[PDB]
Design an enzyme around this catalytic site. Structure first.
Site, mmCIF file in Angstrom:
data_model
loop_
_atom_site.group_PDB
_atom_site.id
_atom_site.type_symbol
_atom_site.label_atom_id
_atom_site.label_comp_id
_atom_site.label_asym_id
_atom_site.label_seq_id
_atom_site.Cartn_x
_atom_site.Cartn_y
_atom_site.Cartn_z
ATOM 1 N N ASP A 43 41.595 8.397 45.216
ATOM 2 C CA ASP A 43 42.336 8.906 46.350
ATOM 3 C C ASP A 43 41.590 9.971 47.107
ATOM 4 O OD1 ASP A 43 44.671 8.626 48.079
ATOM 5 O OD2 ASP A 43 45.781 10.022 46.807
ATOM 6 N N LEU B 143 50.921 26.944 47.104
ATOM 7 C CA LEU B 143 49.744 26.520 47.861
ATOM 8 C C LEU B 143 50.041 25.177 48.538
ATOM 9 C CD1 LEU B 143 47.098 27.575 45.205
ATOM 10 C CD2 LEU B 143 47.580 28.672 47.418
ATOM 11 N N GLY B 144 50.737 24.301 47.826
ATOM 12 C CA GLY B 144 51.130 23.024 48.393
ATOM 13 C C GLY B 144 51.632 22.153 47.287
ATOM 14 N N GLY C 78 53.903 17.047 41.542
ATOM 15 C CA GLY C 78 54.264 18.412 41.263
ATOM 16 C C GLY C 78 53.772 19.398 42.294
ATOM 17 N N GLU C 79 53.932 20.663 41.927
ATOM 18 C CA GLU C 79 53.661 21.786 42.801
ATOM 19 C C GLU C 79 52.451 22.574 42.329
ATOM 20 O OE1 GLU C 79 56.665 24.746 42.969
ATOM 21 O OE2 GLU C 79 56.452 24.989 45.175
ATOM 22 N N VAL C 80 51.677 23.066 43.290
ATOM 23 C CA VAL C 80 50.572 23.944 43.007
ATOM 24 C C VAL C 80 50.877 25.365 43.531
ATOM 25 C CG1 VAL C 80 48.119 24.373 43.361
ATOM 26 C CG2 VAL C 80 48.967 22.030 42.949
ATOM 27 N N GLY D 84 50.331 18.734 45.153
ATOM 28 C CA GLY D 84 49.380 17.660 44.849
ATOM 29 C C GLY D 84 50.051 16.278 44.873
HETATM 30 N N1 LIG Z 1 46.143 18.571 40.674
HETATM 31 C C1 LIG Z 1 45.935 18.966 41.724
HETATM 32 C C2 LIG Z 1 45.643 19.516 42.999
HETATM 33 C C3 LIG Z 1 45.760 18.769 44.163
HETATM 34 C C4 LIG Z 1 45.435 19.377 45.380
HETATM 35 C C5 LIG Z 1 44.981 20.715 45.427
HETATM 36 C C6 LIG Z 1 44.957 21.466 44.254
HETATM 37 C C7 LIG Z 1 44.373 22.810 44.333
HETATM 38 C C8 LIG Z 1 43.507 23.246 43.328
HETATM 39 N N2 LIG Z 1 43.015 24.413 43.707
HETATM 40 C C9 LIG Z 1 43.516 24.746 44.890
HETATM 41 N N3 LIG Z 1 43.254 25.802 45.657
HETATM 42 C C10 LIG Z 1 43.826 26.027 46.830
HETATM 43 N N4 LIG Z 1 44.683 25.114 47.281
HETATM 44 C C11 LIG Z 1 44.946 23.983 46.598
HETATM 45 N N5 LIG Z 1 45.859 23.178 47.199
HETATM 46 C C12 LIG Z 1 46.864 22.525 46.339
HETATM 47 C C13 LIG Z 1 47.711 21.463 47.047
HETATM 48 O O1 LIG Z 1 47.935 21.722 48.424
HETATM 49 C C14 LIG Z 1 46.807 22.048 49.141
HETATM 50 C C15 LIG Z 1 46.082 23.311 48.636
HETATM 51 C C16 LIG Z 1 44.367 23.763 45.348
HETATM 52 C C17 LIG Z 1 45.195 20.840 43.062
#
Ligand SMILES: N#Cc1cccc(-c2c[nH]c3ncnc(N4CCOCC4)c23)c1
Ligand SMILES: [Cl-]
EC number: 2.7.11.1
Length: 259
Positions: free
Chosen positions: A119, A12-13, A18-20, A15
């Site tokens: 943040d 997903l990306g 680390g990695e999500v 944070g």
């Molecule tokens: N710790 C933590 C953290 C930080 C940022 C985002 C997430 C995240 C939780 N639920 C998500 N659902 C869909 N995309 C998500 N993200 C993840 C990061 O990149 C963007 C898209 C998340 C978690």
């Protein structure tokens, strides 16, 4: 790869750390998000288990599996607020207002449990399938109030264009006005699709211009007078003169019926 019953289908990306990954349970087909950290995080899990609010990302739980911690969290299928801001334009004012209302509901909730996020910015503000906003990422979060006693903060953290000026200038500072400030820079970004300054320091010309009230310049000239009057209350250099959330909720633009 996979973790107990869940498959790690895709990234997903990233944070703050680390990695999500998108995790889909092979059985039930439920999709969640999992943050994967190699090898501070006792504190984070501790804060994550406090969180229960519809504008905050929900923590489902965690599993240590050798080197790797797996933090299971609500998935937000709408992506981030970052992706809804068109550069140089922003978004429609009614959409901005709706997201601002939700952001404040989340921030009030956190502050009410004695947590500061530290943040707030569009990357950490995620959207569910109905475009409901959720505040994500508690890796920089900390307790500022415990047993009804407030503690001042001293750690510098956050992201420069979003950070309040006292954090660059004061040895210690109150937590809540810092998160309020960053909500004001998010509001500006939504309404103008540009950040107003690289940092809120006396050496930053755009920050000086704002303090001199040159709102005939960008980004301020793209913003209507009602939301701009709110931004004049939020982006106030002295944090004890800065508007509080109770008073934001009384602001004219905050309460203005919009499309
Ligand atoms: N710790 C933590 C953290 C930080 C940022 C985002 C997430 C995240 C939780 N639920 C998500 N659902 C869909 N995309 C998500 N993200 C993840 C990061 O990149 C963007 C898209 C998340 C978690
Ligand atoms: Cl932006």
């Amino acid at each position: 790869p996979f973790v107990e019953d869940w498959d790690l289908v895709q990234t997903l990306g990233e944070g703050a750390y680390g990695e999500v990954q998108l995790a889909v349970n092979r059985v039930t087909e439920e999709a969640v998000a999992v943050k994967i950290v190699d090898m501070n995080i006792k504190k984070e899990i501790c804060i994550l288990k406090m969180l229960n609010h519809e504008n905050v990302i929900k923590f489902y739980g965690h599993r240590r599996e050798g080197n790797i911690q797996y933090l299971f969290m609500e998935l937000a299928s709408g992506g981030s607020l970052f992706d809804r801001i068109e550069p140089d334009i922003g978004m429609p004012e009614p959409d901005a207002q709706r997201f601002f209302h939700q952001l404040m509901a989340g921030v009030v909730y956190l502050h009410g449990i004695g947590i500061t996020h530290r943040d707030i910015k569009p990357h950490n503000l995620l959207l569910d399938e109905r475009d409901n906003l959720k505040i994500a990422d508690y890796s920089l979060a900390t307790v500022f109030r415990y047993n009804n006693r407030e503690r001042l903060l001293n750690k510098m953290c956050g992201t420069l264009p979003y950070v309040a000026p006292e954090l660059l200038k004061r040895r210690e500072f109150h937590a809540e006005p810092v998160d309020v400030w960053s909500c004001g820079i998010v509001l500006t970004a939504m309404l103008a699709g540009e950040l107003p300054w690289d940092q809120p320091s006396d050496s930053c010309q755009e920050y000086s211009d704002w303090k001199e009230k040159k709102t005939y310049l960008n980004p301020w000239k793209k913003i209507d007078s009602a939301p701009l009057a709110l931004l004049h209350k939020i982006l106030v250099e002295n944090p004890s003169a800065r508007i509080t959330i109770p008073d934001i909720k009384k602001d004219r633009w905050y309460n203005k019926p919009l499309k």
